[PDB]
């Protein structure tokens, strides 16, 4: 709250105007966008308020858990950005990741959001490459035997 | 790759490193699970096989 | 350095008291993290403080 006062030349007090109001930045995510790739995951947030001064902090990990206050311990972290691209070999196409996203500004935190993301489920668009290509070269003795 | 911090006050010194690539094997190619056909092929193969 | 005094009504200058420091930002990198991949390095140095 904030007491505004007017004070003549002696400055004897008047009476008193006050305004109270109050100030955080939450600012839990609205949505979450996840874009598969080769071995990647593009993790994209989004709010319902945008404000130009939150960045929004990732954790990964492999399997669910049932508590949400060990994330700290369970998790681990990999970056504070805008976005983020989950990039890595370990991973393989069809195993379900979780990201738990929160915001971060100056003040400071957010609640938890959960997402769940997978890599690309093979279809066809990682085919049209090799048209005439492949040659003998990169078989090994199985072409040599079988020929 | 030379790496340095760089901030508004100043500069700092340079830290070197040395990467090289991934070279995982039957695991990476996981993807390609029997989908090349006869379009992906090669010519010698084609005529030979 | 910073030099602070006290000052009476007229302004006659008290014993002055002295305090010293200094301000840097080095912020060497402590280790280096590499993450090798598919045709990739990614790069996510760190530094200890």
Same mark, same amino acid.
């Given at each position: 709250? %904030? /007491?505004v006062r007017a004070v003549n030349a002696w400055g004897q007090q008047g009476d008193p105007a006050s305004v109270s109001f109050r100030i955080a930045a939450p600012?839990?995510?609205?949505? #979450? &966008?996840?874009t598969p790739g080769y071995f990647q995951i593009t993790a994209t947030? *989004? %709010? @319902?308020v945008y404000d130009p001064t939150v960045q929004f902090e990732f954790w990964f990990s492999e399997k669910q858990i049932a508590d949400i206050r060990q994330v700290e311990t369970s998790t681990r972290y990999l970056g /504070? @950005? %805008?976005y983020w691209i989950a990039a890595s070999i370990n991973i393989?196409?069809? *195993?379900?990741y979780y990201?738990? #996203?929160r915001s971060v500004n100056t003040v400071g935190k957010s609640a938890f959001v959960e997402a769940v993301?997978? @890599?690309?489920?093979?279809? &066809?668009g990682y085919l049209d490459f090799f048209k005439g290509k492949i040659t003998e070269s990169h078989l090994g003795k199985e072409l040599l035997e079988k020929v």
């Open positions: 709250r %904030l /007491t600012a839990a995510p609205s949505r #979450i &966008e996840l947030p *989004h %709010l @319902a /504070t @950005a %805008l393989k196409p069809g *195993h379900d990201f738990y #996203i993301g997978r @890599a690309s489920d093979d279809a &066809e």
